[PDB]
Design a protein around this ligand. Structure first.
Ligand SMILES: *[C@@H]1O[C@H](CO)[C@@H](O[C@@H]2O[C@H](CO)[C@@H](O[C@@H]3O[C@H](CO[C@H]4O[C@H](CO[C@H]5O[C@H](CO)[C@@H](O)[C@H](O)[C@@H]5O)[C@@H](O)[C@H](O[C@H]5O[C@H](CO)[C@@H](O)[C@H](O)[C@@H]5O[C@H]5O[C@H](CO)[C@@H](O)[C@H](O)[C@@H]5O)[C@@H]4O)[C@@H](O)[C@H](O[C@H]4O[C@H](CO)[C@@H](O)[C@H](O)[C@@H]4O[C@@H]4O[C@H](CO)[C@@H](O)[C@H](O)[C@H]4NC(C)=O)[C@@H]3O)[C@H](O)[C@H]2NC(C)=O)[C@H](O)[C@H]1NC(C)=O
Ligand SMILES: *[C@@H]1O[C@H](CO)[C@@H](O[C@@H]2O[C@H](CO)[C@@H](O)[C@H](O)[C@H]2NC(C)=O)[C@H](O)[C@H]1NC(C)=O
Ligand SMILES: *[C@@H]1O[C@H](CO)[C@@H](O[C@@H]2O[C@H](CO)[C@@H](O)[C@H](O)[C@H]2NC(C)=O)[C@H](O)[C@H]1NC(C)=O
Ligand SMILES: *[C@@H]1O[C@H](CO)[C@@H](O[C@@H]2O[C@H](CO)[C@@H](O)[C@H](O)[C@H]2NC(C)=O)[C@H](O)[C@H]1NC(C)=O
Ligand SMILES: *[C@@H]1O[C@H](CO)[C@@H](O[C@@H]2O[C@H](CO)[C@@H](O)[C@H](O)[C@H]2NC(C)=O)[C@H](O)[C@H]1NC(C)=O
Ligand SMILES: *[C@@H]1O[C@H](CO)[C@@H](O[C@@H]2O[C@H](CO)[C@@H](O)[C@H](O)[C@H]2NC(C)=O)[C@H](O)[C@H]1NC(C)=O
Ligand SMILES: *[C@@H]1O[C@H](CO)[C@@H](O[C@@H]2O[C@H](CO)[C@@H](O)[C@H](O)[C@H]2NC(C)=O)[C@H](O)[C@H]1NC(C)=O
Ligand code: NAG
Ligand code: NAG
Ligand code: NAG
Lengths: 48, 133, 453, 97, 49, 49, 44
């Protein structure tokens, strides 16, 4: 999971890395805010 | 090559196996297919490109991909996979548009047009100002 | 120096066209690395241990992405000249008497248009480059099997790195090179860059030759000889792609460097770095959790060192490619689209015209220069004037005042600085100057400018 | 102490290669540069060589920057003396400053 | 040392390539001697300089 | 283990030396080209710049 | 009208500080000298 802490110390938003490709991009670059572009991403979804 | 059940590349990676059943199998790591994401900040939309992979193989190999990618591949949706010269792409529609400036290049003179707040595949073609004979 | 008045000057009597070849790199091969897969290969135990070294993978990805973005911007800037470059259509094969067949893209009546010229086809066939499977490399590496010459490309799907395709397809590069060829001809006596004149190639070449010290009479007399020498010079460089050619060797050096980076990246995964094995699975199978961590850590440290070295060298080559690309733009603007007055910048000798063709990972330049072959020792004068109470002294313009010989009653003539051909002195090739002590005093024989009619 | 760096070649296991050219070749190069300074100035090419003396070449260079012939004729000795003073002053210019 | 790959061969090749490039670079600079026209200067004084 | 520690230290030293040697070679090549340009512009002719 | 312009110099008055007399001087040294066709050209 990717967690964002606000100024008061609480978690305001979260990202499930293995949900979709956008989440994979965010967890690969460790940023909620990503500029426009084309990025190579890793895999975060585990299977049996 | 010889009476050996294992095939190795120059870098000592196991790439091929001969089994008891009689088949030959290619051996690849559990994460092998390259994945790239095209993201547009203005519309908060994204698309997926599988570089150098035929669309037909992507359907069979789904375990590497994310959950939503697996669901979309299984759902056989209308905007489904499209074969380009840079690999198989998802979330694109083939258009005959021609542009001279690109913000989301894909290589080989290919461009991606973000939707106005799916993606469109455009092409970069330049025109000389004038010709004087 | 001679002991008489005036000076001795060596003026050429025969000449030939020399060609200087130069290769300038513009781009390198863009590489992206899946850091997580490269380091841990999907094992959760390794990934847990990797967190103790910080956010390594995110920094690696950001650095590589920034480098690729900078290279894309650099290559985009170079090709933008196509949009605002005025061009004129050239003739097929012969433009007057000069033969430009090999520099043009052969037109085809039916089928697919070609994107390579004859000389470009000769250049590309002499260089061995592997096909980096842009469309179906993943499937081809399975259908073809293990091959030594192709293992570097097929290592992409095992080691965990990707070779990105270039920004522009070869058709765009062909359009760029054709754009350069169509802008060589133009005016030469103007002092601006806002007007375009549709002057034929032959007239442009003759204007360029007249500006370096060759008179119009010599050009008129030796028109066919000049054309034949130019054709011989252009045709001789078709078979100049050998191992003895240093400029041709640098293209192979660039290709070998691109191959070497991926060879270094792929080979580091087979090292144990002092551990019992180079495979995480073997370590987990042969050892227990109290002792597995140390071996996994040794492998992690080795692979992190390899990735850091690869990233550093990749950034170095990106910066060098950007500077070389800027140099290419300057070379095009100075040598290709105009005539250079500098020495040594556009080849050797007096520069006349240059051509640029596509090359692997860069551009290839052919600099054509005026190369004299024989000289004559000519007696020259600083200036000439008559003998009056007020004197009127004259000086040559773009030439010399010489005597008509190869070794009070002397007759002075004018000749071009780049070819020895005496001709009578008129106001066209002379100008009035101040009185100088070293000027010759003409007592009896006076040119028309020195006559007080 | 001042020579341990050189003698460390045969203990540490590294070698210092000699340069491609001996100093005589470099001296020939520098002498070649000195002998090509003089030449013509009003020509528009690089294919002709004129054996003009050094003094005349210097005076032609001075005339092209905005100095008339009359001034050069009047101030010939002064110009020569100033040039000699300028050249001789740089012999003692190899200091830490 | 074998467990770290072919380290020594790569080191030798890199150093050899660097030295070869430097030799080519210095050779290119000195090639002007062959095709530079020169004239003999006087000893000490050339006019008044 | 002790021999491995010495090996790792010396490999790191050699890699650093090779990298800096290549850097200085490239800088020397560019400076040599600058010298050629300076000679052609300032020494064998008069500069208007 | 026929107007002239200096060549590689200036048209200056002979002084360090309708009847003015104009001369020519070099751009790199102050030395007034009479204006002739050598150091002048016709302009618009
Ligand atoms: C605006 O700008 C647009 C972009 O610039 C432009 O669109 C482009 O138009 C051009 C020209 O019309 C198109 O070029 C053509 O591309 C064809 C497809 O190429 C891909 O696929 C091949 C493999 O083929 C398989 O897939 C195709 C479908 O994609 C399928 O049709 C075929 O049956 C196969 O299943 C692949 O080889 C190509 O990739 C290689 O080449 C690229 C360069 O072209 C490289 O960048 C890439 O790295 C690959 O390189 C490797 O392989 C080559 C070949 O071996 C080596 O040289 C190289 O070293 C390296 O190993 C790509 O993925 C292509 O089939 C087609 O080929 C013909 O034309 C060229 C040039 O004349 C010849 O060299 C070919 O031999 C062949 O010529 C003849 O073509 C006719 C008619 O098609 C056939 O009947 C003949 O049989 C054939 N002859 C022979 C002997 O084969 C050509 O390259 C380009 O794709 C378009 N780009 C797009 C749409 O993005 C557009 O026009 C512009 N618009 C305007 C208005 O100006
Ligand atoms: C689909 O995309 C292609 C480009 O990949 C467009 O261009 C056609 O491509 C096919 C297959 O290579 C050629 O046979 C046609 O001649 C191409 N047409 C043109 C005009 O270049 C194609 O038009 C696209 N289809 C659409 C937008 O419906
Ligand atoms: C310049 O040199 C060339 C090459 O030597 C001369 O060409 C020769 O021309 C004569 C006839 O005049 C032929 O018989 C020779 O075979 C040619 N030599 C070759 C082709 O190598 C040319 O005449 C010279 N020009 C002059 C002296 O003005
Ligand atoms: C201009 O040069 C081209 C080659 O660049 C000449 O074309 C060659 O002609 C010969 C003789 O007929 C053929 O054997 C070759 O196959 C041609 N090469 C090609 C087409 O690449 C052409 O003849 C020359 N033109 C003139 C007028 O001499
Ligand atoms: C300069 O001298 C040359 C000879 O050194 C002259 O050329 C000769 O001209 C005469 C008279 O027309 C011809 O009969 C000869 O055949 C020419 N010789 C050659 C080798 O071509 C030339 O005319 C002189 N130039 C002048 C006077 O301007
Ligand atoms: C042409 O005649 C003039 C006469 O005005 C010569 O000028 C003299 O040159 C000598 C040195 O050669 C000086 O010492 C004299 O002072 C000059 N005389 C004057 C009146 O200024 C000039 O040398 C002659 N040109 C030659 C011989 O080539
Ligand atoms: C310009 O004016 C200067 C003085 O400001 C003139 O120089 C003087 O000329 C007179 C007449 O020949 C001499 O008696 C003086 O000794 C000169 N003074 C100096 C300081 O040298 C000069 O001749 C004038 N130039 C012209 C009129 O062209
Ligand atoms: C000049 O001629 C060209 C064709 O050579 C034509 O396209 C263009 O419109 C003309 N320009 C004007 C201003 O008439
Ligand atoms: C092995 O190397 C040889 C010699 O370079 C080459 O001809 C051959 O194709 C290579 N074999 C494979 C399977 O790559
Ligand atoms: C020791 O250092 C001093 C001071 O620099 C020097 O003069 C002397 O020669 C050195 N001795 C040796 C043996 O190198």
């Amino acid at each position: 999971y990717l967690l964002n802490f606000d100024v008061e110390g609480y978690i305001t938003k979260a990202v499930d890395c293995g949900y979709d490709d956008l989440a994979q991009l965010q967890c690969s670059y460790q940023s909620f805010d990503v500029e426009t572009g084309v990025y190579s991403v890793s895999s975060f979804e585990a299977s049996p | 090559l010889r009476n050996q059940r294992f095939v190795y590349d120059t870098f000592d990676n196991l790439v091929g196996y001969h089994s008891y059943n009689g088949n030959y199998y290619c051996v690849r790591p559990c994460v092998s297919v390259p994945v790239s994401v095209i993201y547009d900040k203005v519309s908060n939309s994204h698309a997926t490109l599988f570089g150098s992979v035929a669309c037909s193989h992507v359907t069979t190999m789904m375990s590497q991909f994310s959950r939503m990618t697996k669901t979309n591949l299984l759902a056989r949706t209308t905007p489904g996979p499209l074969q380009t010269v840079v690999g198989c792409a998802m979330g694109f529609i083939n258009t005959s548009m021609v542009v001279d400036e690109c913000q989301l290049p894909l290589g080989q003179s290919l461009c991606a047009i973000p939707p106005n707040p799916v993606f469109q595949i455009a092409t970069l073609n330049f025109t000389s100002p004038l010709t004087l004979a | 120096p001679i002991n008489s008045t005036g000076f001795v000057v060596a003026v050429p009597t025969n000449f030939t066209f020399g060609v200087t070849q130069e290769y300038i790199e513009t781009t390198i091969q863009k590489i992206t690395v899946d850091c997580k897969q490269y380091v841990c290969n999907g094992f959760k135990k390794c990934e847990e241990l990797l967190t103790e070294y910080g956010q390594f993978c995110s920094k690696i990805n950001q650095a590589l992405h920034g480098a690729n973005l900078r290279q894309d911007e650099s290559i985009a800037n170079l090709f933008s000249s196509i949009k605002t470059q005025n061009t004129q259509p050239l003739q097929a094969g012969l433009n007057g008497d000069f033969n430009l067949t090999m520099l043009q893209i052969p037109q085809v009546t039916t089928g697919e248009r070609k994107y390579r010229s004859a000389i470009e086809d000769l250049l590309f066939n002499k260089v061995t480059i592997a096909d980096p499977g842009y469309m179906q490399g993943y499937d081809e590496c399975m259908q073809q099997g293990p091959q030594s010459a192709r293992d570097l490309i097929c290592a992409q799907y095992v080691a965990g790195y990707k070779v990105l395709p270039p920004l522009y397809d070869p058709y765009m590069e062909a359009a760029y090179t054709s754009s350069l060829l169509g802008s060589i001809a133009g005016a030469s006596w103007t002092a601006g860059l806002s007007s375009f004149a549709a002057i034929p190639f032959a007239q442009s070449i003759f204007y360029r030759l007249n500006g370096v010290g060759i008179t119009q009479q010599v050009l008129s007399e030796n028109q066919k000889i000049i054309a034949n020498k130019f054709n011989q010079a252009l045709g001789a460089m078709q078979t100049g792609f050998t191992t003895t050619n240093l400029a041709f060797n640098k293209v192979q050096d660039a290709v070998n460097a691109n191959a070497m980076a991926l060879s270094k990246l792929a080979a580091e995964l087979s090292n144990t770095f002092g551990a019992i094995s180079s495979s995480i699975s073997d370590i987990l199978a042969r050892l227990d959790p109290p002792e597995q961590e140390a071996q996994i850590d040794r492998l992690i440290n080795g692979r992190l060192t390899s990735l850091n070295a690869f990233v550093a060298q990749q950034l170095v080559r990106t910066e060098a490619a950007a500077r070389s690309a800027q140099l290419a733009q300057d070379k095009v603007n100075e040598c290709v689209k105009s005539q250079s007055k500098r020495n040594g910048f556009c080849g050797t000798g007096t520069h006349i015209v240059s051509f640029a063709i596509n090359a692997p990972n860069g551009l290839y330049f052919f600099h054509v220069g005026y190369q004299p072959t024989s000289h004559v020792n000519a007696t020259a004068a600083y200036g000439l004037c008559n003998t009056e109470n007020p004197p009127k002294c004259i000086a040559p313009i773009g030439g010399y005042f010489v005597l008509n010989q190869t070794t009070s009653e002397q007759q002075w003539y004018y000749t071009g600085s780049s070819f020895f051909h005496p001709e009578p002195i008129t106001e066209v090739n002379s100008k009035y100057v101040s009185m100088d002590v070293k000027f010759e005093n003409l007592t009896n024989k006076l040119p028309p400018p020195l006559l007080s009619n």
